[PDB]
Design an enzyme around this catalytic site. Structure first.
Site, PDB file in Angstrom:
ATOM      1  N   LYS C 200      15.674  38.312 -14.420  1.00 18.15           N
ATOM      2  CA  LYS C 200      14.718  37.233 -14.669  1.00 18.15           C
ATOM      3  C   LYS C 200      14.036  37.508 -16.013  1.00 18.15           C
ATOM      4  CE  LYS C 200      10.631  34.902 -12.977  1.00 18.15           C
ATOM      5  NZ  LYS C 200       9.738  34.573 -11.855  1.00 18.15           N
ATOM      6  N   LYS C 246      17.857  34.089 -13.981  1.00 18.20           N
ATOM      7  CA  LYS C 246      16.847  33.036 -14.278  1.00 18.20           C
ATOM      8  C   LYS C 246      16.247  33.293 -15.661  1.00 18.20           C
ATOM      9  CE  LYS C 246      12.469  31.170 -12.579  1.00 18.20           C
ATOM     10  NZ  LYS C 246      11.259  31.641 -11.863  1.00 18.20           N
TER      11      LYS C 246
HETATM   12 ZN   LIG Z   1       5.763  35.560  -9.815  1.00 22.17          ZN
END
Ligand SMILES: [Zn+2]
Ligand SMILES: [K+]
Ligand SMILES: [K+]
Ligand SMILES: [K+]
Ligand SMILES: [K+]
Ligand SMILES: [K+]
Ligand SMILES: [K+]
Ligand SMILES: [Mg+2]
Ligand SMILES: [Mg+2]
Ligand SMILES: [Mg+2]
Ligand SMILES: [Mg+2]
Ligand SMILES: [Mg+2]
Ligand SMILES: [Mg+2]
Ligand SMILES: [Zn+2]
Ligand SMILES: [Zn+2]
Ligand SMILES: [Zn+2]
Ligand SMILES: [Zn+2]
Ligand SMILES: [Zn+2]
Lengths: 321, 321, 321, 321, 321, 321
Positions: C200, C246
């Site tokens: 992420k 992500k």
């Molecule tokens: Zn968070």
């Protein structure tokens, strides 16, 4: 893929600066540079090193002054190498972990003055033993592995307590990375990085370091390459955040294999003798100054993420212009 | 190796800016940027493109004015896209090889004023056919492959004659790279580079280019990845000096595979629709301006050597700070 | 294998729809779609999001109504994102594990009403802290790793107790997957899946999420690719059933490397800013609606097994027709 | 990574339909199916094939009737297999290239009525020789390679002239792909695809085809796998657009290796004997009908892009539900 | 390596039997065969299986008689499948570990009579539960993983005590291999092999087994291939001596990947439905008897070290002649 | 995977003959054996070879007598080595292509009596030159490459004309495979196999062949391994049907690399010196006879498809038991 002259002429991309720039595979930036610096005891001390033209040993007050320029140039980190007064050397290397030792005092001073500057301390006993080996000797004159780790651990903890963001064990004891990591974690030093000297060779290129500040039973045989991969694998498993090859240029094949095999943050040390070689040749007019950036670009091309280099200030100046 | 929490905490290198800098794997530089530019026929004219906020079609005098700043910012090359007056279009696409066509005039003007700036011309018939397909149509409306190559070859030679250093066939005819290469070599244009649009997809992301300036039988199916490797292999064998993927961000996986498979100079086009969707969101306040550098860094991380991007000026300005 | 024009013409398979269908390498289906949804407190609440045209925040009663269509369309799972009332935010993030919190109530309601629908809850503290960081702060404003894990564990257990089949830790603390797995196993939640947000990034593409509902010390540097492999390796070792990248489109090269290296169930999040970009351009007439399926097909081609996408309902409708 | 029970329980993703759907690695679609069909000489005739329950030989009028439904179901292509009247067979196989032969008539009829439907003709002499070997015999009964190619080339051209989009040489003569490709190119049949039967084995699974409609010196030894890779490499170099393995299920390992090695469009034939053994068991109540989809999913999982299968209609019907 | 027709004609090695023999890549021998056998309670019992022509269920006295031939043929091992009297089935599956159960009595009898013959017992609860699932059910009808392992462990120990050299867990519970290995080691059964059914699919090809003697939450989805590698990796780490794929022919791609990835002893089960399919077709005259050896040779070519096959006696007879 | 004692005990599969049989990775069969045989000029003559105990030079009538038993044992092929009468040797090696030379007579005689037996002739000048070098000497005593090829080509054609199915150039001239292939193809010997001695070393293990029947400028340096891969690649590109390594056991690593790199039919020669050292030790009572099968199994394990061995009869006899 079936590329053949004259459909393929590799000179075409070389024909103009613009195309050479577009296809250029690697770049050196100031984000890649770490500046090693020799630190003296005392106040208002500055010592030229005959065998490293242009490099000075600095007391801490002078270091703080010079670091102003280094920070303004954007150099991300310093690697500190204390020059221990001969009278403070001992069999037990206890000065290694003295909270009032040079490295510890220098670390506290720089961490206060320049909070964003990385400080990488040197975890090793060689500048603290009377005999100059990297660990504690047994009665046969052999460098004991695990007993030495106990002292290295105390040293590393003392550096963390002084505020170093990175400790860099340069000792080549087996298992020291995991021992140091375990100690840092247990003490709450969760984010102190460990930059392992993973593949450190028993090399002739260290000559000039001695003037700045047996080994074949711990440091690696220059002949060996596969062995460096096993060394790095262990250090990564033991928790190293970065791994290092030393010396540098004479080992670029090792940098390449290490980067390729592990895809981890990989560092390289352009050692005192490499600096001296290049600087002597430059001063004699045998090599142009452009060799400095070429030498450093080599490390990038070979896969290094960062370079410990005594050329860091000059390189940073050249890069900025 | 066997890296495991808590010995390995990947946040340690993230803890401080200096360490993030040291371990950063990729960087964007000005040397990576190619600026595409739409060129008009007249004098002292610019046109705003509705579907590409901030991008202007430029007459050649205005192109020379803006290029002074592009050159000052260090942008290595431009990609020229003429906007053909409707009255000059035809079924045979003959305007493609007119020595006084927009592309050829623009090339001569730029080569004379800015001798170090790279000029990449567009080898394709779509701006020269009445119907806007990239090649010549047969009586059933199929785009003929080899007949189209013959026109493309004449166009490419006309660009070389005008002094372009690079010609970039964007047509996706089979075999055109080799045909163009042979023609260049036979005419003595030894050093003219060919930047093949190798993996060019039949994409919805081209929306705004038609405003700025059947396809599934030549451009690639967005579903297909392995096919892109076969396309690139052919172009390299046929003599391309660089290979390109288009569109860009929606195809970063293709960039990665292409670089990994061939380790050849690999370029990527961030097309009109990618520009428009980013710029629209920035103007609406939905995304920060920092997204521009992020999008371009993505290309570098994915393995691109260079990026054709309508953001090249804005990026170069940001990188100069 | 030695394929050369004109024996090999890659246009032949492109000549007709039937052959393009036979060679098409990837397909999108409704089995690939996960629908993220913002959930409000209260009753009969529906709020348009200016920066995400077409997306609404929904109270639980409205969510149950809309989920009728989603289930009828065959969408396999929802990912729930509560919108915490500002007054329930705190330093200790305790609302994260309140059995009567929005996420927990929504989970129980959907699990009863639609027993076959997958519910993926969000394990993170950022929508529960006053400061909006993903974990608990120390006195220097740093997000503490292990203290935050303790709260994330309580949160995950509360979601399991509410009946969620999947918990998805989006926090980027080191080691949290193993800690959460250990807690689920110890509590008897043997079959609760953990969908790790493994790679992420600290990204500009999150803009619009904030309107729907520092980071560089935990979320990843966009520049880094190799690091994502080390992140995923740890999460798989720690027991993740699925791993996620992500943002999405700007990171398709990462999806590709992750799928190739580990051959594990790999997911990708087409984030708020990606949705906003595309939707703005569609509404302006700059991109055709067909760009939606193309964007989603990209994720499949890049190696994803499933996609979290705010386009899920529209895509599912288009796929069914 | 180091995935270990109980942190990793591979049953978690199996727990619910929704998660099995999300992680499912392969899917069968209608776009994957090619329907083989045996074609008779007469009018308003069908024949039941004893060794292939449910499959019928069809006169061309009946073929056009059934194809309306095949097209409605979305089947992309048919593979035509003529059933030559015994009186038209000969030592020279001249009926193979008759412009009014069954295959050619059937092709013209289908291309006219269903212009989007793919027609794949069978390039081989076995249905045209009196003895039923796939090529021309010398006086010792050896199947001559290059003499047979000359006939195969004429046959392939006749198919192209009749409008087939794909010709599929099933003969296993050495070098025939390149010979046919050269002939097609020289005659202007630029876009006619060649689907090579590349790895075609000397198999007992062909039992029922002889009923429907020496070999070890041309067809491959079932024992051999590496040899199949060499066969495919040659066909790709010679210009094949697609490559095929035959038989199918008994050779799924070959499919996998071929796809992995070449990443080219790879097809597989589920032959008469495979059909008969499945259908026989289904009719005896020994296997459920669901085995049909399972057998076809196997091909997808093994790496096939498309499947020639006598179950294509039944599969398409099931997939439409 | 650059092999091209006509310098390379792959038919040359096919021209004569002697050269086909010299280049033949794989061979089937009787050392590759394992004979599965259904075992009845009682004395002088022999039951034909309608859906497996030629296979008989045998009481132990009849099994001992038939095993004389099997041993004389050189078949290395039997795999025993008891047919549990319906009245001995229960919720707790306790008959699974009854020292006087069919499998245990059969094992002791064969171990005494034929000391060199391998006996592979079946570790699973499905022939002992009233419901026929492979483990113990919870109150929602789900097959509990760890509770089932406890019973499987007792079963495996009972087989070891009876003298089985190999136990073969066919249950598909997570972690059962390591649990069984731990129990065998603790009990002193140091050399009892564990033949894991590692990648056992939820398949339609099992039809006829039921007549001889839900699942998607434990047995694998036919669509999945990568998942099989993760299954096998775990079983090898947990201590399996052999790993198995089931079913067989429809999964030859899985055999191939498993052998290639792990280089471990790899086995495959040609299941009841595969046997039935082939035998039905042979009896109908649709396939020649030579299909038996071809089917078995396929498994060798795909990488199997051994094959569980109901054809083992006939194959062994054919091989010896 | 992570296999570790005691969960993994590699002795379990070793515990019993039946399991060792099931997991055995390689087997030797009669189909792997090629029998070399020295052939004399006269009638009703045999000669014992002092340095090869048990091997006899055979006149053609005696060769036909012994071959009856070789054929009965199922040996697929012989390799013929004529023993040229000294009076027929010359500087031009013309006896090499005499249609009534020993090799040619022996070939015709065997092809007529045993039509299924493979005959592999030796294409080399060393048995036909007065000096015994494998090619023609220039005036400085260097073995000329291309002049020697011309003679080798004539010799190979003479063998084809006599009916040999395989010709095996043992000369190590550069380029000879392609020259011979071209000649065979141009003369219509389409199916004559070429078994290249590809990696033939300058070895001390040939001692006894000179008794039976400068070199470093053509035969390979025993030190070199990578070079063998380049040799084989050239021979495959030049059209060889099989490739060979010679000597054998001292070069098993080369066999392994060659098989792994090219996956082509790979043969190995267990030369005279290897035979003599084994046979001498067996006769002295220093090694058991079982060493013969062990030595030949080694070749199979190393990747050989076939083995030229003076032990072929003895091996075939043992394998028939
Ligand atoms: Zn968070
Ligand atoms: K660049
Ligand atoms: K750096
Ligand atoms: K398809
Ligand atoms: K899916
Ligand atoms: K063989
Ligand atoms: K075996
Ligand atoms: Mg070490
Ligand atoms: Mg192309
Ligand atoms: Mg992580
Ligand atoms: Mg072939
Ligand atoms: Mg398992
Ligand atoms: Mg050679
Ligand atoms: Zn030291
Ligand atoms: Zn165009
Ligand atoms: Zn045929
Ligand atoms: Zn079971
Ligand atoms: Zn010779």
């Amino acid at each position: 893929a079936n590329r053949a002259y004259p459909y393929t002429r590799l000179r075409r991309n070389r024909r103009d600066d613009f195309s050479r720039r577009l296809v250029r595979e690697n770049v050196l930036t100031v984000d890649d540079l770490i500046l090693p610096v020799f630190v003296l005891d005392g106040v208002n001390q500055r010592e030229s090193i005959p065998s490293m033209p242009g490099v000075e040993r600095l007391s801490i007050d002078q270091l703080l002054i010079e670091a102003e320029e280094w920070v303004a140039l954007g150099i991300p980190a310093l690697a500190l190498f204390p020059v221990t007064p001969v009278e403070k050397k001992s069999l037990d290397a206890a000065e290694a972990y003295n909270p009032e030792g040079i490295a510890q005092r220098a670390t506290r001073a720089l961490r206060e003055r320049f909070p964003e500057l990385g400080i990488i301390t040197d975890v090793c006993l060689c500048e603290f033993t009377t005999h100059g080996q990297c660990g504690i000797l047994d009665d046969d004159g052999y460098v004991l592995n695990d007993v030495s780790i106990d002292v290295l651990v105390r040293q590393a903890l003392s550096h963390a307590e002084a505020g170093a963001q990175v400790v860099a064990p340069s000792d080549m004891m087996d298992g020291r990375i995991g021992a140091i990591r375990e100690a840092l974690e247990s003490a709450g030093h969760t984010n102190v990085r460990v930059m392992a000297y993973s593949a450190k060779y028993a090399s002739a290129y260290y000559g000039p370091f001695r003037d700045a500040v047996n080994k074949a039973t711990y440091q690696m045989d220059p002949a060996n390459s596969d062995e460096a991969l096993h060394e790095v694998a262990a250090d990564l498993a033991e928790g190293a955040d970065m791994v290092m090859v030393k010396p540098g240029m004479p080992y670029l094949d090792i940098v390449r294999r290490v980067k390729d095999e592990f895809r981890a943050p990989t560092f390289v040390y352009q050692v005192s003798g490499e600096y001296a070689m290049h600087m002597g040749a430059i001063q004699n007019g045998w090599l142009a100054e452009s060799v400095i950036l070429e030498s450093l670009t080599a490390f990038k091309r070979a896969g290094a993420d960062g370079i410990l280099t005594y050329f860091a200030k000059q390189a940073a100046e050249q890069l900025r212009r």
